[PDB]
């Protein structure tokens, strides 16, 4: 670990890239599924013709 201490910039940029990927995944799910802001419910009756 003491020898690795001088590669902190490399490891920081690695973890920055991975954190960006993770935030991107959360954002992707949000854009696909959370388009509608309101949670509509199905009617109790199913008279859909």
């Amino acid at each position: 670990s003491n020898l690795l201490l001088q590669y902190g910039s490399f490891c920081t940029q690695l973890n920055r890239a991975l954190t960006g990927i993770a935030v991107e995944q959360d954002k992707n799910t949000q854009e696909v599924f959370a388009q509608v802001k309101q949670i509509y419910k199905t009617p109790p009756i199913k008279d859909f013709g």
């Binding site: 201490l5 902190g8 920081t12 973890n15």
Partner: protein
């Protein structure tokens, strides 16, 4: 027995191998520091530099 002690105090602590993040100001003086791996917030401050 024929003596008295003047008022003074001293404090003793022990050093450990630690990683520190030191801040050198514009005049070259260490004005502040972060003891790394004290608490998780300090680890975050280390990683973010």
């Amino acid at each position: 027995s024929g003596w008295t002690a003047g008022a003074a105090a001293y404090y003793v602590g022990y050093l450990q191998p630690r990683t520190f993040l030191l801040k050198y100001n514009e005049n070259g003086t260490i004005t502040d520091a972060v003891d790394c791996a004290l608490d998780p917030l300090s680890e975050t401050k280390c990683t973010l530099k």
